[PDB]
Amino acid sequence: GTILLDLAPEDKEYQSVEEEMQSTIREHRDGGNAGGIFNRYNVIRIQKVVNKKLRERFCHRQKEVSEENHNHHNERMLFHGSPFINAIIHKGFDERHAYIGGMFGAGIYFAENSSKSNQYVYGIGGGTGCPTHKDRSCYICHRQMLFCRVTLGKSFLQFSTMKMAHAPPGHHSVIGRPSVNGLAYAEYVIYRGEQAYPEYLITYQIMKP
Ligand SMILES: C[C@]1(c2nc3cccc(C(N)=O)c3[nH]2)CCCN1
Ligand SMILES: [Zn+2]
């Protein structure tokens, strides 16, 4: 199954992932209630997720989407936060765990901003926070998030709630675009687990300002 390769802090690949993560911290409307109060992370390690079977499923789907999208799979690197990160790195993303109540329905959701994904690391609205101290703004406990290859293909642009079970006809993803009366930041949604690969596993802490 899955093998985790350690990236060295001196390598360009580690430094690239960390800078995407650190540079995309945004101020959130909840004033940090969900993800905590911070302006920076302390990155503990960065591992590359290797899984032959998961990679094969992802690459086959990229070929199918490409055939339906003028020979482009339209891949983006995006963040994902979830309390089920262990299941994802071993079994892959799974749309069967997605439920229809989400803003864009039963999809798998990603963000270009790491601080958005940091809000979901411990669950719904940050849940009860870290397992040891029950603190959503814990500065001690190691959190984990993924920085994923996401196959978007033909994206359907959406501004308001649209509870879908699958991608809209003739499309492969939904992009929830920001709007004055809606989202502050874009969110990217897929409806098939094989349209995302959990490429990097980031272990980190949020830092006290
Ligand atoms: C609220 C919801 C969610 N919306 C997101 C928007 C951007 C990123 C993420 C993430 N997990 O990194 C999101 N997760 C709907 C599905 C379960 N959690
Ligand atoms: Zn803690």
* DSSP string computed for 71-96: T---EEEEEE--TTHHHHHHH---GG
Give the total residue count for the chain: 209
Q: Is the CB of 118 under 6 A from ligand 1?
A: no
Q: Is 69 helix (H, G, I), strand (E, B) or coil?
A: coil
Q: Are 28 and 115 in contact (CB under 8 A)?
A: yes
Q: Tell me the ligand closest to 93's alpha carbon.
A: 1
C-alpha 99 to ligand 1 mean position (Å): 12
Task: Give the count of domains, the chain.
Answer: 1
Q: Is the CB of 102 under 6 A from ligand 1?
A: yes
List the one residue out of 28, 146, 16, 34 whose CA is nearest residue 79. 146
Q: Which protein residue's CA is at the shortest distance from atom 8 of ligand 1?
A: 110
137-161 burial string, b = 16+ CB within 10 Å, else e? bbeeeebbbbbbbbbbbbbbebeee
Residue 189 CA, chain-centre distance (Å), reads 10
Rounded to whole angstroms, what are the CA distances from 87 to 82, 92, 97, 124, 148?
10, 7, 11, 17, 15
Atom of ligand 1 nearest to the CA of 102: 15
Query: Cα separation of 86 and 91, whole Å?
Result: 9
Q: Is the CB of 109 under 6 A from ligand 1?
A: yes
Burial class (CB in 10 A: 0-12, 13-18, 19+), 103: middle
Q: Is 141 annotated as a binding residue?
A: yes
Method by which the coordinates were obtained: X-ray
Q: Are 79 and 200 in contact (CB under 8 A)?
A: no
Q: Which domain holds residue 183?
A: 1-209
